[PDB]
A paper describes a structure:
3’,5’-cyclic uridine monophosphate (cUMP) and 3’,5’-cyclic cytidine monophosphate (cCMP) have been established as bacterial second messengers in the phage defense system, named pyrimidine cyclase system for anti-phage resistance (Pycsar). Until 2021, scientists reported that a group of bacterial nucleotide cyclases, which utilize UTP, and CTP to synthesize cUMP and cCMP, defend against bacteriophage infection, proving that cUMP, and cCMP are authentic second messengers controlling anti-phage defense in prokaryotes. This anti-phage system, termed pyrimidine cyclase system for antiphage resistance (Pycsar), contains a pyrimidine cyclase PycC and a receptor protein with either transmembrane domain (PycTM) or Toll/interleukin-1 receptor domain (PycTIR). Upon phage infections, produced cyclic mono-pyrimidines activates their receptors PycTM, which disrupts membrane integrity by forming transmembrane-spanning pore, or PycTIR, which deplete NAD+, leading to growth arrests and cell deaths, thus protecting the uninfected bacterial populations, a strategy called “abortive infection”. In this study, we aimed to structurally, and functionally characterize both cUMP- and cCMP-synthesizing PycC and cUMP receptor PycTIR.
The NpPycTIRCNBD crystal structure in the space group P6522 contains only one polypeptide in the asymmetric unit (from residues 1–91 and 98–140), forming a central six-stranded antiparallel β-barrel surrounded by five α-helices. The loop connecting β5 and β6 and the last ten amino acids at the C-terminus are unresolved in the NpPycTIRCNBD crystal structure owing to structural flexibility. Structural comparison of NpPycTIRCNBD with PsPycTIRCNBD shows r.m.s.d. of 1.1 and 0.9 for 116 and 117 Cα pairs, respectively. ITC results showed that both NpPycTIRCNBD and PsPycTIRCNBD bind tightly to cUMP with nanomolar affinity at a 1:1 binding stoichiometry. cUMP also showed strong binding to AhPycTIRCNBD and SmPycTIRCNBD with dissociation constant (KD) of 8.2 × 10−7 M and 2.7 × 10−7 M, demonstrating that PycTIR is a high-affinity cUMP receptor. The Pycsar system has two types of downstream effectors: PycTM and PycTIR. The binding of cUMP by PycTIR is probably an example of induce-fit: cUMP induces the conformational change of the helix and promotes the dimerization of PycTIRCNBD, which subsequently strengthens the recognition of cUMP by inter-subunit contact, including the specificity-determining residue N143.
Author numbering: 1 to 91, 98 to 140
């Protein structure tokens, strides 16, 4: 479908999406960094049961969960569920088989593009250093 997607795509819903991105672990109300991550990434609507990540795979991809819920799973056993505002994958092959619990919207990025954004943000770099305690 695109009902969720449609709530977010186009110049029309640019604000709502940017607004959404800021309320993420990594962005932490750094707007410039979202506006960049907005441009860098591709919105995807995901059906209930739809896999964004096979585990054992080498997807450099990392998804911002903008709306809905993702069920992390390892070796057959449910782990966490990430939700609106969180992210999935990395920061080695793939840890977990992430899948969608209900309709979910994500923003998909490549490790590569991600870090050239990462690496230019004093703000993010500062925030990853603070969380580096043993």
């Amino acid at each position: 479908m695109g009902a969720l997607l449609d709530r977010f795509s186009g110049d029309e819903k640019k604000g709502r999406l940017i607004e959404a991105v800021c309320g993420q672990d990594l962005v932490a109300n750094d707007k410039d960094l979202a506006e960049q991550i907005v441009a860098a990434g591709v919105l995807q609507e995901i059906a209930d049961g739809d896999v964004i990540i096979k585990q054992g795979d080498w997807d450099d991809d990392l998804f911002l969960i903008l709306a809905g819920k993702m069920q992390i799973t390892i070796n057959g056993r449910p782990q966490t569920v990430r939700e609106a505002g969180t992210h999935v994958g990395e920061l080695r092959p793939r840890t977990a088989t992430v899948s969608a619990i209900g309709e979910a919207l994500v923003l998909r990025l490549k490790r590569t593009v991600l870090d050239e954004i990462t690496r230019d943000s004093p703000a993010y770099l500062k925030r990853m250093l603070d969380v580096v305690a043993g």
